[PDB]
Design a protein around this ligand. Structure first.
Ligand SMILES: [Ca+2]
Ligand SMILES: [Ca+2]
Lengths: 141, 141
């Protein structure tokens, strides 16, 4: 039926986008996950637990991504003033710079794949799928 | 901007759906990937290379899924009459039965998350995102 197709098409779009993003982001020395980590911390420090849960990826995958971004000087680990085991991943200036370059790449690709759509259509679709997301997130967790 | 949000919302929807599907499919003794393997072979035998490429997953992940489904008696390996290394993964009757049960679960979830939408809206959104998919697939590969 149609409702099945909306969800399955969403999935196919995600897989194709994730693959192309991985390729285009490679030139900034980042994978799609590394970019997601930068996007998440671009607006504030994030715990590694949050990162793994928000983007549905193993904790070991987050550890690998953060270790990498840290070596690249794009994020830093900030330990609580009194506690030490409590860690927050904060983005750096260089990281924000790289993130912004990542956003342009994402924006460029988003403009292409949605080219057959007009502003009205884009807004119409966005409004409607935002409802779908609200529902699945209320269900999923 | 809006075009960015369409793609990012698509991704968030995918992650939330994949997580809930994994949970609901667990009762049929399948993960989301195993279900994808059954969906792919439900209409005809598929090579393992195709499976890994179509659903963007490592070959080792496909091997693990197929080994599993085979032990569960849901798929079989069919070797060419003359060649032996050439393998096709064919679904079994039990596999089709299990697949169909999987489809009902997917259908049930799809109906819920898209509840705020009407038939017209569903068709309208489907038509439009199918264009997005056509474009990304032409770009991605
Ligand atoms: Ca809930
Ligand atoms: Ca091409």
């Amino acid at each position: 039926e149609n409702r099945i197709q909306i969800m399955s098409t969403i999935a196919k779009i995600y897989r194709a986008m994730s693959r192309e993003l991985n390729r285009r982001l490679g030139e900034l020395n980042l994978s799609y996950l590394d970019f997601l980590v930068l996007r998440a911390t671009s607006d504030g420090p994030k715990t590694m637990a949050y990162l793994a849960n928000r983007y549905f990826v193993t904790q070991s995958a987050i550890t690998a991504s953060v270790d990498k971004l840290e070596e690249m000087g794009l994020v830093v680990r900030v330990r609580d003033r009194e506690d030490a085991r409590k860690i927050l991943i904060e983005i750096t200036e260089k990281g924000l710079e790289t993130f912004n370059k990542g956003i342009e790449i994402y924006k460029k690709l988003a403009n292409e794949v949605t080219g057959d759509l007009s502003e009205d259509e884009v807004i119409l679709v966005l409004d409607k799928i935002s409802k779908i997301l609200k529902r699945i997130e209320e269900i999923s967790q």
